[PDB]
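Supplementary Text 2. Reproducibility record for the structural model of the 371-residue chain.

All settings were left at their defaults, and a single model was retained for analysis rather than an ensemble. We include the record here because the model underlies the residue-level annotations in Supplementary Table 4.
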Amino acid sequence: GLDSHELARLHELARHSHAVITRHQDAGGAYPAAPTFSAYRGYAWLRDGSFTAEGISRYGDVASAGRFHDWVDGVLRRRRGQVDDLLAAVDRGEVPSNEGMLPTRFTFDGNDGSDPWWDFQTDGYGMWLWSVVTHAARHGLDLERWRAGIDVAVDYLLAFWDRPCYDWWAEHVEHRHVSTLGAIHGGLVAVGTCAALRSAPWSAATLQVAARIRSLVSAEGVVDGHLVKWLGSSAVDGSLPACVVPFGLVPPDDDVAAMTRAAVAKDLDVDGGVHRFAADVFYGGGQWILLSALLGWNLAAAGDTAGALRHLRWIADQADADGDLPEQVPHHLLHPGSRAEWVARWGTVATPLLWSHGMYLILADELGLLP
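Retained model, structure tokens:
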């Protein structure tokens, strides 16, 4: 599907993606989100980091991916007491406030980097379980290395999966977001179907809760045959294809998968660049590299290789002179009047965004194009 010109350029962007991720990996193992972007510098997310780690794992850098899982594991084991206290509070009928939950941003030394009253999210813990299990399966590794951290994440998610929280985009705390529910499902099915974890005390519970998640999405998260942004909405979100691949609510050839890819393409995909959601005003609502990669990945998995390649090509066209991939680009803006104030307040768009490069690596790998 590619000529030598394209292949050379895609191979170089893959090599550069591995380099930029591993060069900026913190000494303690964390992947940063964006080392030069004002609002993200100094922090790590489990969401960004897990997809970054999956790209690196597919690339074959076992060492780098493993240091990220080490970091996450250690951060989570340090929260064993906090999670036990939350669970005890629940058992007393004293449901903890958002302000007491596990964080979204982490500092590189594992402390809260943001106050979860303002950005409480549960997806990243689900993504990490999916990522570490997938990595260990790929490379034949013993999960006992990371098991006590896995136990913290599983205990937390089994208790709090059905709580309203902010979405992947740190918005709309009162709602329950289908790509958040999807991320949690992916992580729970990963550990619940992992033979190395067959004797864990939570083994069966993780598949029962994953089924509960699918019940909720079936009841309130599907409209006109497609997934929707949050339970009880009609709109779509560019994150929704993650609920198919990799998180597995439905197979790639399911009608809901096809209809969801179609709805995202129709409502959010302009010339290969995928918007987050129609109402998005963040930097005017630009086109996100990681969402184009996510749609491309899902198209590849469904057998639409040409569609996958079209999105891969669009991403490659957004690399700057150094090969760096931005968070988003403004070739099409949903709400152009809103862009200037964001640029003024936080500066020019995050570049490189490590998650952009991680997703690039995943899609390139799916298409058999790693050098």
